[PDB]
With several copies, the nearest count.
Chain A
Amino acid sequence: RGSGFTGTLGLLRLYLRRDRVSLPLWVLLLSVPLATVYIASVETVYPDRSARAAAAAAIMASPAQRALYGPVYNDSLGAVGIWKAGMFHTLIAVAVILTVIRHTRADEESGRAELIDSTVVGRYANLTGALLLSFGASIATGAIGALGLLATDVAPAGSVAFGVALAASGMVFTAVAAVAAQLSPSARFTRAVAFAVLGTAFALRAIGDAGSGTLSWCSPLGWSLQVRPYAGERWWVLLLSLATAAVLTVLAYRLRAGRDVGAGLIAERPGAGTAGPMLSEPFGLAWRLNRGSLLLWTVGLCLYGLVMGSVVHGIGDQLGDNTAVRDIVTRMGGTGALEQAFLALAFTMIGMVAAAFAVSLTLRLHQEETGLRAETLLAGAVSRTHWLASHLAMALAGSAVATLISGVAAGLAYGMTVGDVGGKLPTVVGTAAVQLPAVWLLSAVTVGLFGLAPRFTPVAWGVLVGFIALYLLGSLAGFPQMLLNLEPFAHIPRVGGGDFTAVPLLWLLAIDAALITLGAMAFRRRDVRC
């Protein structure tokens, strides 16, 4: 009566309950902003075939955009409109990798999948449950994307082709995550392997696209882009991602069938037996705790800034002259030129990303406290402000160095583009470093929360989101100019020419210091509760 797949549906329902909020979010948040945000935004920007042909030529005459998103094959509304949704393949890959690793590993690692296994469940119920959940999530987001696209005036066949391409891109990396989850007892190591496979697929696709295009055929990302939705659909390449998914699922089951529940197939690197000369205080400990996140975020922001430096010159010649563009880049973005008034939009979103970086590294403080590891630190000869100065120090310094390296990369790319770097690098570095008063806030906000309302510490994320909303929904619309001052990014001045008053910088720095001081003073007189 019982088989090796018993309890598959019960385990699936457990998984579905356990992420009943995150899954609907990243399914809807990755599928509905296809027709309502991308294609609508190209309709607004390029209303005629003549503009779309110029946009396609621009894209095809720039290695950076053709590498970050791929090529454009014709000037149809659908094709040009969906050329930029092409990062949704990487985003669905990230989502499915995270889901599979969360529900297969990190559930054995915590010992939950031996209490489960000790019930009436088969040997392959956990793997099949997580695989089925991720396949269903990919199919659901693809179907919702196709349903949204079919509510627009684009090619009906291309909508279905892109939806199926997104679903297949999700399924292939569901399979690779299932394979990787059998490889190591550590969930972090399996995530690293899966994301390294995803990153090398992305690199292969990017190198191929900005070139002859041959190498792009060797990456699971790229099989999705070469389906050519709205540009002449090649449906036969979808079964090229079906074979890979089937082979990797078979391999995942084969690896599962020959390993014990506790761990599998790769031992972990031992480490050291003494705590060096640097592990002797909270600063050296939080450096060890944070350096991985600093490296990841800094590399990401440097690569992100390196993208804009090459997409500045070559962003004057090609916009909707006298459209919203050239009338948006001025108001949200500062009036003046069109090259200089665009760095203010690239960096006012490399500052938002750095603000998220800061919020993460400052929420590590709340994680340490609620994880029972702060009462272990503060039961030693560690001051209550010496702790919370390490996490603040690395949060602020990491945000600063990440933003400054982003600015240096963008300035180097921009200078290499237009002749000389010596005249453009200082301006770009100034544009990057002027965002610091507004990225150090949301570190002051999180510290103010942690000390006056520790359980309402994560709401800082919402505040950040709120700011972003108040920056977009409010600055792209006729919202009043009295509640648009409630978020700090609008007040960042522009470096170049004039109109650089440096007063809002001082006000933001004072606000940041006051909030940090309130957080520290209210932590020093507060019960460390767990």
Chain B
Amino acid sequence: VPIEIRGLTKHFGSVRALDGLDLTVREGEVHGFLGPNGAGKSTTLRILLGLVKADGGSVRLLGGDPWTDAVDLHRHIAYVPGDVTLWPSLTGGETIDLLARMRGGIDNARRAELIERFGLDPTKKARTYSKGNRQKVSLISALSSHATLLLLDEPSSGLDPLMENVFQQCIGEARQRGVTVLLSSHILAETEALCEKVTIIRAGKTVESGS
């Protein structure tokens, strides 16, 4: 069970319960994580990474706990930020390998074909990239990386339907190598296309779950 949360609670200012009684269980599949912007999906992803500490409940990421074991557990994990923000002075090739090398590594054979079919130009400084091309850097860095667990967060933002289809096919290919995926989409069409066993959260709680 890569992810098993039940009972999660967190108050931020104490003026914002962002979490009360949250639940989630993943087993080696693709899981949809649905809810509004203020419902606490970002807080849950940032607690799964060592970034934020929880007030209560059990969080158990790949066996260990995300807070203390935040360095040993992060090499079997890839992450795509909701807002992909990069370094303006670095080219695309140097950010797809700086990110992968500070995680679990990069597979060159997969990296070459991913660059070939996302149609990226990795000799371009990242300042000149558009938003469709800024997302491709993160997607290539995450999808060509040892990772038994992918934490995507709005993975396809700014991508034309063709690159959407390519990304869906890549996720389908990854799913049968034993890679567990979290989508957290905001676009229910791709969630319906890819994921089974969605979970819908309203305020801090999970109001619905299942296939």
Contact = CB atoms under 8 A, between A and B. Distances in A.
Interface stretch (B29-37, B77-85, B169-177, B180-188): B77-85
Contacts of B86: 112, 373
Interface string B85-107: 11111111111111101111000
B89 A118 contact: no
Nearest to B89: A18
Question: Which interface class (under 10, 10 to 19, 20 to 34, 35 or more) fits A?
Answer: 35 or more
Contacts of A379: 49, 51, 74, 77, 79, 81, 151
Interface in A255-314: 260-262, 268-276, 279-282, 285, 288-289
Contacts of A525: 53
A185 B74 contact: no
Most B Cβ at <10 Å: residue of A116, A372, A381: A381
Contact of A280 (B87, B93, B98, B128): B98
B25 to A, nearest CB: 22
A111 interface: yes
A186 interface: yes
Most A Cβ at <10 Å: residue of B84, B88, B151: B84
A380 interface: yes
B57 to A, nearest CB: 16
Interface stretch (B118-126, B158-166, B197-205): B118-126
A273 B102 contact: no
Given A120-B74, A260-B52, A275-B97, A280 B102 contact: yes
A376 B86 CA distance: 9
Contact of A270 (B70, B87, B123): B123
B98 A279 contact: yes
A271 B90 contact: yes
Contacts of B103: 119-120, 380-381
Interface stretch (A6-14, A401-409, A417-425): A6-14
A444 B50 CA distance: 25
Contact of A2 (B46, B72, B79, B99): B72
B207 interface: no
A499 interface: no
A6 B75 CA distance: 12
B17 interface: no
Contacts of B84: 110-112, 114-115
Given A2-B72, A268-B128, A376 B123 contact: no
A502 to B, nearest CB: 40
Contacts of B94: 271-276, 279
B71 interface: yes
Nearest to B76: A381
Nearest to A3: B71
18 contacts: A2-B69, A2-B70, A109-B127, A114-B46, A114-B81, A119-B99, A121-B102, A122-B71, A186-B127, A260-B52, A273-B122, A275-B90, A279-B94, A371-B85, A373-B85, A380-B102, A528-B46, A528-B52
Interface of A: 1-4, 6-7, 10, 14, 17-18, 109-112, 114-123, 185-186, 188, 260-262, 268-276, 279-282, 285, 288-289, 371-373, 375-384, 525, 527-529
